[PDB]
Structure formats: structure tokens, C-alpha cells
Amino acid sequence: GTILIDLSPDDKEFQSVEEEMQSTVREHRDGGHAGGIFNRYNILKIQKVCNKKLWERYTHRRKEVSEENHNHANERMLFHGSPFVNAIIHKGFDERHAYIGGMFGAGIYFAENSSKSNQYVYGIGGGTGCPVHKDRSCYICHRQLLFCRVTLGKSFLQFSAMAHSPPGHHSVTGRPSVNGLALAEYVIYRGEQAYPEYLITYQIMRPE
């Protein structure tokens, strides 16, 4: 039931999503091992993701969380990158793959840094990189990220040295406390708490 609508590069909406992608690239402590070496992207396509059922699922859960959190959904726009992106756009986020988890436990992870989500496009640790060249820093092959509407509700703040939610909380905020340029990561435990609003097709660019 999913439709993808191309945005024009002349459209303010395209431009805004591109700027959020470009402006949230940072350096990573792996020197580029997982995601590649780059400071910016070549954005090839930005599509709006339209699915009435998945949207309704999301707004129903958002209402539940908002009411539990004293009329505050605490809704954000966040990146998600993974090998599941093609499944997600059609069937929604699925918490039966929360067990994979990460530094903040089982759950579905989102990032404020686009470049953090870029590290997961080819799997955990970048997997073995792109299918065609087996290169985690491939400048040729096209990548995809989602830019998602995410309901955090009452979020448990977890400082980081870089499953069900904590009792009474709807999500976890993983906040790096050592790297002062690293933005937060977030974890949800119900797939209905995120909607994949934009599908972004891009290349990382080789620094000049």
C-alpha cells in the first residue's frame, strides 16, 4: 500500500531534508571504517513515503503515548539506516528485530547524525560494505537512508561513554558524553512509534 513520491530539487521540502542530511555529517571515531570516509553526500533522490495504514498505526500510537505523557508526544525527525530499509517502507518498523539492539539495549535505533545512520546501511559495523565492490567506503554504489517521524514520549536519558522501554518511559535517549560533537541516538521499543517519512538515495563523496 506504499507509494513513493519524488520531490523536486527545486522544492523547499527537498532542500530542507538535504540540509538536515548534510549539516549532520560528523567525523566518526572509527576513522571511517564502518561508513566510509566523507564530509558530505551527493543526494540523488528524496521520495516522500505514503502509506495510509502505516500512518494510521503511527498516529494511533502517537495519541496513546501523548496522553500517557501529559499531552506531549515528544515527536522528532531522525535518521535510520539499515539493510531493512526496503522492508520498512512497505511493512513499517517491526520490533521482532529489536533483539539485534545496540549500546542502549534491544530496540529500534535512530540518530540525529545522518553519518551515524550511514554506518548501518550495509549492516552492523558496515557489514562487508557495498554488494558490488565489498567496500564500506564505496563512492560509486547508491545508498539509502530513511528520515523518520519518531514519537519519543517520556524518554529515559542515558549518558553514553562515546526489550521493553524503561518502566514509565516510551523510549531511550542515548547521549554521547565524551565526543562533544556527537549528537544523540534514540531507541524505541514499538515499531508503531516511528513512521518512515522520507527515503533518501545518495552517494558518499570522496573528500577533495
Ligand SMILES: Cc1cc(C(F)(F)F)nc2[nH]c(=O)c3ccccc3c12
Ligand atoms: C544499532 C543499529 C542497528 C541497526 C541494524 F541492526 F542494522 F538494524 N541499524 C541501526 N540504524 C541506525 O540508523 C542507528 C542509528 C543510531 C544508532 C544505532 C543504529 C542502528
Ligand SMILES: [Zn+2]
Ligand atoms: Zn560499490
